[PDB]
Design an enzyme around this catalytic site. Structure first.
Site, PDB file in Angstrom:
ATOM      1  N   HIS A 162       6.540  -5.951  -2.058  1.00 30.23           N
ATOM      2  CA  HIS A 162       7.206  -5.881  -3.360  1.00 30.23           C
ATOM      3  C   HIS A 162       8.677  -5.481  -3.285  1.00 30.23           C
ATOM      4  O   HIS A 162       9.367  -5.568  -4.305  1.00 30.23           O
ATOM      5  CB  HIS A 162       6.498  -4.892  -4.285  1.00 30.23           C
ATOM      6  CG  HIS A 162       5.134  -5.339  -4.688  1.00 30.23           C
ATOM      7  ND1 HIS A 162       4.881  -6.602  -5.196  1.00 30.23           N
ATOM      8  CD2 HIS A 162       3.938  -4.709  -4.618  1.00 30.23           C
ATOM      9  CE1 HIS A 162       3.589  -6.706  -5.461  1.00 30.23           C
ATOM     10  NE2 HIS A 162       2.995  -5.581  -5.114  1.00 30.23           N
ATOM     11  N   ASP A 198      -2.377 -10.701  -0.477  1.00 28.21           N
ATOM     12  CA  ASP A 198      -2.549  -9.553  -1.353  1.00 28.21           C
ATOM     13  C   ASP A 198      -2.739 -10.019  -2.792  1.00 28.21           C
ATOM     14  O   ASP A 198      -2.246 -11.074  -3.199  1.00 28.21           O
ATOM     15  CB  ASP A 198      -1.310  -8.642  -1.220  1.00 28.21           C
ATOM     16  CG  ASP A 198      -1.402  -7.359  -2.045  1.00 28.21           C
ATOM     17  OD1 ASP A 198      -1.196  -7.386  -3.271  1.00 28.21           O
ATOM     18  OD2 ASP A 198      -1.655  -6.294  -1.452  1.00 28.21           O
ATOM     19  N   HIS A 200      -1.467  -8.998  -5.470  1.00 30.40           N
ATOM     20  CA  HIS A 200      -0.247  -9.057  -6.259  1.00 30.40           C
ATOM     21  C   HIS A 200       0.742 -10.036  -5.647  1.00 30.40           C
ATOM     22  O   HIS A 200       0.716 -10.308  -4.445  1.00 30.40           O
ATOM     23  CB  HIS A 200       0.391  -7.659  -6.358  1.00 30.40           C
ATOM     24  CG  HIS A 200      -0.521  -6.637  -6.953  1.00 30.40           C
ATOM     25  ND1 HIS A 200      -1.400  -5.891  -6.192  1.00 30.40           N
ATOM     26  CD2 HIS A 200      -0.758  -6.302  -8.243  1.00 30.40           C
ATOM     27  CE1 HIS A 200      -2.124  -5.125  -6.988  1.00 30.40           C
ATOM     28  NE2 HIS A 200      -1.758  -5.359  -8.238  1.00 30.40           N
ATOM     29  N   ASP A 287      -6.792  -5.726  -1.805  1.00 29.14           N
ATOM     30  CA  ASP A 287      -7.058  -5.429  -3.199  1.00 29.14           C
ATOM     31  C   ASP A 287      -7.549  -6.662  -3.962  1.00 29.14           C
ATOM     32  O   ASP A 287      -7.643  -6.622  -5.186  1.00 29.14           O
ATOM     33  CB  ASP A 287      -5.833  -4.777  -3.897  1.00 29.14           C
ATOM     34  CG  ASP A 287      -4.478  -5.456  -3.595  1.00 29.14           C
ATOM     35  OD1 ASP A 287      -4.456  -6.538  -2.967  1.00 29.14           O
ATOM     36  OD2 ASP A 287      -3.415  -4.889  -4.010  1.00 29.14           O
TER      37      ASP A 287
HETATM   38  N1  LIG Z   1       0.441   3.117 -11.965  1.00 26.88           N
HETATM   39  C1  LIG Z   1       0.753   1.704 -11.829  1.00 26.88           C
HETATM   40  C2  LIG Z   1      -0.382   0.974 -11.094  1.00 26.88           C
HETATM   41  C3  LIG Z   1       0.168  -0.371 -10.633  1.00 26.88           C
HETATM   42  N2  LIG Z   1       1.045  -0.217  -9.480  1.00 26.88           N
HETATM   43  C4  LIG Z   1       1.699  -1.494  -9.200  1.00 26.88           C
HETATM   44  C5  LIG Z   1       0.837  -2.398  -8.334  1.00 26.88           C
HETATM   45  C6  LIG Z   1       1.096  -2.047  -6.881  1.00 26.88           C
HETATM   46  C7  LIG Z   1       0.451  -3.092  -5.961  1.00 26.88           C
HETATM   47  C8  LIG Z   1       0.859  -2.692  -4.556  1.00 26.88           C
HETATM   48  S1  LIG Z   1       0.167  -3.762  -3.264  1.00 26.88           S
HETATM   49  K   LIG Z   2      -0.219 -12.271  -2.944  1.00 25.36           K
HETATM   50 ZN   LIG Z   3      -1.473  -5.419  -4.013  1.00 24.21          ZN
END
Ligand SMILES: NCCCNCCCCCS
Ligand SMILES: [K+]
Ligand SMILES: [Zn+2]
Ligand SMILES: NCCCNCCCCCS
Ligand SMILES: [K+]
Ligand SMILES: [K+]
Ligand SMILES: [K+]
Ligand SMILES: [Mg+2]
Ligand SMILES: [Mg+2]
Ligand SMILES: [Zn+2]
Lengths: 346, 347
Positions: A162, A198, A200, A287
């Site tokens: 990210h 991932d 995200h 995840d």
């Molecule tokens: N308290 C906020 C929860 C979301 N946090 C962002 C997602 C992080 C993904 C990292 S792989």
């Molecule tokens: K991804």
């Molecule tokens: Zn993630």
């Protein structure tokens, strides 16, 4: 069954923050040191391959991806915050809103907001050291592969995908996968692909290479209309300038299971085949798991063996960088399953 | 005897009563608290400044002359969507459009929260919509009083408004009451309006709303945004754009600035207003310029607000005062009402 080496630094534990902004409350952070310790313990349990500590590559390879002002800020942020008298962990309060100027101010609060995309990634003592170690973990895995290993597992923490050239967030500070990809390029690999599995969107990796055709970036992820990072990751983002047609986003809705997710994986593998890269970096998050608390896909533990097997069939030199995965109990089984499937398990 | 000035005040402001404010990495008791408005009202009554009126209901039409329809919809539904999504705290943004990301409105409430904000210190909870609506009606009622013959009126707004853009909330602000009052003057046939922001912080929302327009002159005196909120607007090189070039004026001061230097900036602003020759004046009034204010670094004294009010009266304009910041609740009543009393001739 094959073997794969893992790079791990105990310095990850220097990042051990106490607070995360979530739902209007300060909670215990999701990206906790036990994540890496659980994965490490499964690597040992399964005798995956040699475990080694990173070499020190210094800031040179980090600065091939990240801006000098950003790297300076990450080293000084916590000292500046404490010196300004704040009592909590370092968390942005203000940022460049729409209509404001992308202009770096002097005050630490303004600097914090300028360099961030979210408020859930607290900075505290040891974050710089842990981020430095994590990037060295990625660079050491890349060196292993450049010197002859088919693949290597960079057990990074904090994660990276990210982080932009000069923005932190999503629990990430240095973009370990981009750092590894750029190292391949600097070492004479003509083309590199980065594949983000991932849950995200890898917005940092997309942004870093967005105008370049020599590094193909692909991500499978939850629909950003619905989930983080919200403001990048849509399928119409295909690159700009020389990079047009060299970014591919594949988005999925809530409750997507492996039977459909793997259809996107196949499209990603077909895009990699036509690109024909000289090396592969896989930004690996688990995840996507059905029990993960901050995601909405439905992959099972056995599906990670299938993922690893399919990635091996690309026939490329491959670096895996650890990203997300937040059901701490299952994170070791799921991450190591990818490596074991790559080496022929199941 | 002093002149008299009418004050508009809504008891509905107390519907905005959040429990948390992100500050320095902690959740603290919010600075922008209901006792601010009650302390000012008490002083208005004690000093017998003039009649105290409740606002009229104008509806959202005059609000949407300045704010976008989607933003106004968001503010009405935000709290219900947040609670429905299962969040347990107050509504605070967690993510936003970072540099390099797309200015694209998403579906999820966390995404919408970030899209529509510039900061995380401005919690939303039940009653925030109602309070923001009433505060905009307070400003519009003061504007109506002036347009119907009053020399000046004091809109005792809470929440404040000058940090809100057409579609961004932050800095404790939701609807830009000063901009809404200015636009109401224009819509009623006043050809030119000046908005003078004497709050310690830059009126970034007001600047943004009128930035490409020359019919509304925006001027702000404020602490250097290199050093203080809002950080990313308010610099002296921001003079307007397009057909608004040269119709925005930012006057910046460093830490520990006293009235003897701040008032030089006020004279500069007054000269710019003179050459602009407006038909009406909106003053976005904050008394967080006060030496004891915890959120500010200027050094004005209570008596300096009498001088400010006197000087503003000498502009000779129909004038609406909108209440903005001021966070030493002890002296906020004396300081704000001193501006009105100085305008009406007190010492
Ligand atoms: N308290 C906020 C929860 C979301 N946090 C962002 C997602 C992080 C993904 C990292 S792989
Ligand atoms: K991804
Ligand atoms: Zn993630
Ligand atoms: N917890 C952050 C404190 C700063 N908040 C912004 C200043 C708002 C004054 C606007 S009138
Ligand atoms: K690219
Ligand atoms: K101001
Ligand atoms: K203007
Ligand atoms: Mg500050
Ligand atoms: Mg959400
Ligand atoms: Zn203020």
């Amino acid at each position: 069954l094959g073997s794969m080496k893992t790079v791990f630094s105990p310095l990850h534990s220097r990042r051990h923050v106490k607070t995360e902004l979530d739902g209007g409350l300060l909670i215990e952070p999701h990206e906790k040191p036990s994540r890496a310790e659980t994965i490490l313990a499964r690597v040992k349990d399964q005798a995956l391959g040699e475990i080694l500590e990173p070499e020190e590559f210094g800031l040179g390879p980090v600065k091939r991806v990240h801006t000098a002002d950003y790297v300076s800020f990450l080293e000084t942020c916590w000292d500046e915050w404490v010196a300004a008298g704040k009592r909590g962990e370092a968390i942005p309060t203000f940022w460049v809103g729409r209509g404001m100027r992308a202009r770096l101010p002097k005050d630490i609060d303004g600097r914090l907001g300028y360099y961030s995309l979210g408020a859930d990634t607290s900075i505290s003592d040891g974050t710089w050291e842990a981020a430095r170690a994590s990037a060295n973990v990625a660079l050491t895995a890349q060196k292993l592969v450049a010197e002859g290993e088919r693949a290597a597992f960079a057990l990074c923490r904090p994660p990276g995908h990210h982080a932009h050239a000069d923005v932190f967030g999503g629990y990430c500070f240095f973009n370990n996968a981009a750092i590894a990809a750029q190292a391949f390029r600097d070492q004479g690999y003509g083309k590199v692909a980065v594949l983000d599995v991932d849950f995200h969107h890898g917005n940092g990796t997309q942004a870093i290479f967005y105008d370049r055709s020599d590094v193909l970036t692909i991500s499978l992820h939850g629909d950003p209309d619905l989930v983080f990072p919200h403001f990048l990751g849509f399928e119409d983002e295909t690159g700009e300038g020389d990079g047009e047609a060299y970014n591919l986003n594949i988005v999925f809705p809530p409750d997507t299971p492996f039977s459909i997710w793997s259809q996107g994986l196949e499209k990603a593998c077909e895009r990699i085949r036509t690109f024909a890269p000289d090396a592969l970096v896989v930004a690996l998050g688990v995840d996507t798991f059905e029990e993960d608390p901050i995601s909405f896909f439905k992959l099972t533990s056995g599906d990670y063996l299938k993922l690893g097997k399919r990635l091996e069939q690309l026939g490329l030199p491959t670096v895996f960088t650890m990203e997300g995965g937040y059901d701490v109990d299952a994170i070791g089984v799921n991450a190591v399953n990818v490596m074991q499937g790559f080496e022929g398990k199941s």
